[PDB]
Amino acid sequence: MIIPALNLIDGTVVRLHQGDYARQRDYGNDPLPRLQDYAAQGAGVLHLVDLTGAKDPAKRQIPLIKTLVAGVNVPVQVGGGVRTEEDVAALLKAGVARVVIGSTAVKSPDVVKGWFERFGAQALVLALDVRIDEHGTKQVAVSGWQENSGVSLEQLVETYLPVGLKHVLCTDISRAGTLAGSNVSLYEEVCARYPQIAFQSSGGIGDIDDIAALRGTGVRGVIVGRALLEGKFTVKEAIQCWQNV
Numbered sequence: 001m002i003i004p005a006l007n008l009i010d011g012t013v014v015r016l017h018q019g020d021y022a023r024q025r026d027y028g029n030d031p032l033p034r035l036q037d038y039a040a041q042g043a044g045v046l047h048l049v050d051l052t053g054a055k056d057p058a059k060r061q062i063p064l065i066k067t068l069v070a071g072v073n074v075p076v077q078v079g080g081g082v083r084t085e086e087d088v089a090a091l092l093k094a095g096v097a098r099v100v101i102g103s104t105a106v107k108s109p110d111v112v113k114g115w116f117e118r119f120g121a122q123a124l125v126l127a128l129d130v131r132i133d134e135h136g137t138k139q140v141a142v143s144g145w146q147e148n149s150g151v152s153l154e155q156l157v158e159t160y161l162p163v164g165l166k167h168v169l170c171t172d173i174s175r176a177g178t179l180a181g182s183n184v185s186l187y188e189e190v191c192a193r194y195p196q197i198a199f200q201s202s203g204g205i206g207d208i209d210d211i212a213a214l215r216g217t218g219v220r221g222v223i224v225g226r227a228l229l230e231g232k233f234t235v236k237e238a239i240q241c242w243q244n245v
């Protein structure tokens with residue numbers, strides 16, 4: 001499944017280089033027609049990150065997210081700044097298909113385990129976004145990726161498997177927003193080690209060949225952000241690539 005992504009800062013569509021808030025490129029303040037064009041090209045799922053909320057959970061763009069979710073007729077997943085059980089419930093009530101959770105899943109696993117019991121594993125996506133160190137450890141970043149948790153992707157996956165973890169979004173932060181290509185070896189590895197998890201690849205797609213390159217990894221979703229904003233290819237072309245590979 002190709003999953004087009006938009007990232008939002010104070011109403012504006014942005015790209016961050018490797019998630020660095022000091023390295024923005026701006027793409028206007030009309031995300032809704034963008035999403036609607038993605039849906040008309042065939043997108044089956046859409047992904048939204050509230051970057052303002054990820055940086056400060058008190059400043060989440062809640063009215064805007066509601067407007068975007070209500071404005072398309074395909075499932076939308078939303079992340080960025082979610083901290084409480086009430087946060088999750090409100091997003092689901094507003095029509096969000098899946099809520100994406102990074103920071104709190106690392107910091108408070110007892111709490112997030114209770115969310116799995118309440119909402120079900122189909123409603124939650126864990127964002128296990130990583131900076132891979134020189135030893136190979138896949139260290140998960142938190143707080144809008146501004147902090148290194150010092151906890152490995154695998155430790156966190158094993159933490160939530162017994163409560164039915166099903167969906168994981170895994171960004172290679174070094175690739176995010178760079179057009180350099182996604183980390184094929186990373187997804188080959190993690191998908192094979194956890195066949196019961198539906199992984200979404202994330203970060204780095206630069207052209208259609210980069211999508212084709214993921215064909216044998218086993219990922220269930222392919223997130224694409226910057227390349228679609230820059231028009232390297234269309235959603236229609238991306239979908240055709242993934243269907244055929």
Ligand SMILES: NC(=O)c1ncn([C@@H]2O[C@H](COP(=O)(O)O)[C@@H](O)[C@H]2O)c1/N=C/N[C@@H]1O[C@H](COP(=O)(O)O)[C@@H](O)[C@H]1O
Binds near residue numbers: 005175179
């Ligand atoms: N600093 C950051 O950029 C950042 N910080 C947090 N997130 C997301 O916020 C959510 C977690 O927020 P918390 O629960 O920690 O508050 C998750 O969705 C994280 O991935 C961030 N993700 C931003 N953008 C994603 O980066 C990838 C870029 O792809 P590309 O263009 O094709 O190269 C895509 O997955 C984009 O959606």
